[PDB]
Each structure stands twice: as structure tokens, then as C-alpha cells.
Write a protein that binds this ligand. Structure first.
Ligand SMILES: C[C@@]1(c2cccc(NC(=O)c3ccc(Cl)cn3)c2)COCC(N)=N1
Ligand SMILES: [Cl-]
Length: 376
């Protein structure tokens, strides 16, 4: 799968996007890769902050589905008109598919002011598709209409704003993108890419919480979220343990909550004074787990737009459960193995790390009562 390697691009804090083509003749658009949603939604109107947009009138193969959608979020929101059209991926498999498309006609706090993408490729399952599960997601259509195997994998690499890159391998796994072995965790339910975190460790030390807390109300793997988001009780326990672990220098209480930055002298970044973070995921076999481990390079993010100088704490509290965002996924090569209801983790060949430590995917470990860690 050499032709799909390095097919993702982006800027720091603005997500990873892939080039796609929509309509006949083909209109080129840059589309955010999003494992935490399920709509293929593109800007269909001349928003002043978008570079490009989908012009339905120019497409001979566009079919109107005569149905609106209104999708609000915690802050942002979009509205659009449903349809279908012929979609392709230039740096993907040599195929063309009839996919559902939400033509976004109005939005607020959805598009990023001066990013280089014009839509979202929701890669999750139909259950969370707006307006309902009858709207077939893009990847479900691709698999049905072609011989592309029912899996994809993401290598998100990370860094005025720094220019990031990566790979979305569609229909397979590229072994040059990871070191060591892939370790697999079951997809608990096919809606989001839901998983079960069974144990958390900060600097080798267990938080010793009831493992329902770790997955309350769920844990997901989400390429469309920056932070490692943790449930409130888990976040407090984690921050307290990170604080005790990093007692070289002291910071204000606003830094841990993401209410302010922290800054050092230029080119004197203290990585060594912060701990590694380990999440134990449920394994393939009864009573078996494995642990993925991230470095401070993943969760202390350099912020480039100040007016490496300054940094932000990219672990935050959530009321929507755990979200294993870019902070997690920049450490690992992630295989979304839909055909076998599982998600693979391996150490990524492009993850940022120092001379002393690296990210890791280690196992197997014996953990009891792992199914009790799920929330219902
Ligand atoms: C649909 C939705 C969504 C809407 C609009 C934008 C974005 N995502 C980004 O802007 C972004 C930024 C940085 C990085 Cl590393 C990744 N993604 C996500 C809702 O919110 C969470 C989610 N999973 N998907
Ligand atoms: Cl028209």
C-alpha cells in the first residue's frame, strides 16, 4: 500500500485531512479524517473562511435525497441538505463509490478559521449517523460497492503553525508504519469505536480506581479530538498523581485545567521531569490485557500562536467519557479492524520521543473482571 502512505496532511491543533474528489467532473476537496463521527459532510456554500466548497450544480451525477439535517454539538453546530454523488480518494484505492453527502449550507463554530479542510469524513458506524442509522456512512458504502477489505488504519505523526502529516491506509495494514507487534482490543459496540480501559498507570503507579470510572459512560478512539479526554473523577486522580510525580517545579492550578499555558526559555524543554502515562486495554482473550504507554511529548503540546517557548496540557476532563484523541493516536499506529470487531495498537515509526524514553505497546498481562469495567 505504498501509494497511500503519507496521504494525510495538516496543521497543529487543526486535525489531519485527506484529499477527496466529489462529483462529475470531479471537484477536489480536503476532508478531515474523523473516527468519532459517521457523516460525510462537506461545505456546500461560499463560507468566507473556506478555500473550497462543493458545488452541486456542476455535478451531473448528483442526486438530491430531499431531506435536511440539523446537527448541534456542545458548542458548535451545522445544518445541511442530504444527497448522494460519486466519491473518490486520489491517494487511496483506485475505485469510485456512490456515497451519501451532507451538503453543509450553514454552520457556527464548526469549521476552523483558516484551516485547509472543507468537510468531515465520519469513519465510525451507522448508529451515530445523523439524522438516523439509515444514512449509510462512507466506509460502509466503499466496502459494499468494491473489493476493498473492511478495515483501515491511521498513522498520525504530529509536529507560524507546524505542518503535520500521516497515513490513512484504506483496506489494509502497512508494516513499515509500525515497530514491534500490533496488539488488539475488542470494539465493544459498533457505534463509536468503543473500547474498554481496564487499568490506568502514571509512572508505573496504579490509580486504584474502580475500572467502571475509566469507561463512564464510554471510552472511544477519536481522530477528530485533540486531547486525551478523561472522565472527571479519573482526571482529578490522574492530575493529582501527575502532580506528585512531577515535583521538580511547581505550576498554578489553572495550567492543569487548560485555563492557562506554561512557558520556559526557548530550546530548553523539560521532558524528563514529567511521567509516562499507561492505559491498559481489554485484550482478545478472557482475562488478558495489554498496555499502551505515551510520553510527555504526546500530552504536553507546543502552542505556536503565542504573541519551544510555551506549551499546553492536552489531558482534559470530560462528561462524555474517555476520548483517546490525537494525544493517544500520535504515539501509535492504529488499525480499525472492522471485519474482526477490533482495534490494533502498535508503536508508531513517526512518534516524537527523546533519547531516554519511547512510547510502548507491551503485553500480555493478566487482568480479572475486565467485562465489569464496561458501563451500561
Ligand atoms: C464531528 C466532530 C468535529 C466537528 C468539527 C471539527 C472537529 N475536529 C477538529 O477540528 C480537530 C482538531 C484537531 C485534531 Cl488533532 C482533530 N480534529 C470534530 C464533533 O467533535 C468531536 C468529533 N470527533 N467530531
Ligand atoms: Cl442544481
Amino acid at each position: 500500500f505504498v501509494e497511500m502512505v503519507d496521504n494525510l496532511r495538516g496543521k497543529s491543533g487543526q486535525g489531519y485531512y485527506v484529499e477527496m474528489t466529489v462529483g462529475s467532473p470531479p471537484q477536489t476537496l480536503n476532508i478531515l479524517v474523523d473516527t468519532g463521527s459517521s457523516n460525510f459532510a462537506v461545505g456546500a456554500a461560499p463560507h468566507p473562511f473556506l478555500h473550497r466548497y462543493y458545488q452541486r450544480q456542476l455535478s451531473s451525477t448528483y442526486r438530491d435525497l430531499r431531506k435536511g439535517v440539523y446537527v448541534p454539538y456542545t458548542q458548535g453546530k451545522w445544518e445541511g441538505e442530504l444527497g448522494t454523488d460519486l466519491v473518490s480518494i486520489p491517494h487511496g484505492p483506485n475505485v469510485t463509490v456512490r456515497a451519501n453527502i451532507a451538503a453543509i449550507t450553514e454552520s457556527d463554530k464548526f469549521f476552523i478559521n483558516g484551516s485547509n479542510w472543507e468537510g468531515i469524513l465520519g469513519l465510525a458506524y451507522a448508529e451515530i449517523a445523523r439524522p438516523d442509522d439509515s444514512l449509510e456512512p462512507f466506509f460502509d458504502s466503499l466496502v459494499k460497492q468494491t473489493h476493498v477489505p473492511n478495515l483501515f488504519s491511521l498513522q498520525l505523526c504530529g509536529a507560524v503553525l507546524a505542518s503535520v502529516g500521516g497515513s490513512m491506509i484504506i483496506g489494509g495494514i502497512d508494516h513499515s508504519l509500525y515497530t514491534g507487534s500490533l496488539w488488539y482490543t475488542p470494539i465493544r459496540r459498533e457505534w463509536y469505536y468503543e473500547v474498554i480501559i481496564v487499568r490506568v498507570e502514571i509512572n508505573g503507579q496504579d490509580l486504584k480506581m474502580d475500572c467502571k470510572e475509566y469507561n463512564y459512560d464510554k471510552s472511544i478512539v477519536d481522530s477528530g479530538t485533540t486531547n486525551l479526554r478523561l472522565p472527571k473523577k479519573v482526571f482529578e486522580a490522574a492530575v493529582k498523581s501527575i502532580k506528585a510525580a512531577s515535583s521538580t517545579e511547581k505550576f498554578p492550578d489553572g495550567f492543569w485545567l487548560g485555563e492557562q499555558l506554561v512557558c520556559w526559555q526557548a530550546g530548553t524543554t523539560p521532558w524528563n521531569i514529567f511521567p509516562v502515562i499507561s492505559l491498559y486495554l481489554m485484550g482478545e482473550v478472557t482475562n488478558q490485557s495489554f498496555r499502551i504507554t505515551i510520553l510527555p511529548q504526546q500530552y504536553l503540546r507546543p502552542v505556536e500562536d503565542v504573541a519551544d517557548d510555551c506549551y499546553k496540557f492536552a489531558i482534559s476532563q470530560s462528561s462524555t467519557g474517555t476520548v483517546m484523541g490525537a494525544v493517544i493516536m500520535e504515539g501509535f499506529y492504529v488499525v480499525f479492524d472492522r471485519a474482526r470487531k477490533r482495534i490494533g495498537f502498535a508503536v508508531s515509526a513517526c512518534h516524537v520521543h527523546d533519547e531516554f524514553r519511547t512510547a510502548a505497546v507491551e503485553g500480555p498481562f493478566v487482568t480479572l473482571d475486565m467485562e465489569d469495567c464496561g458501563y451500561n
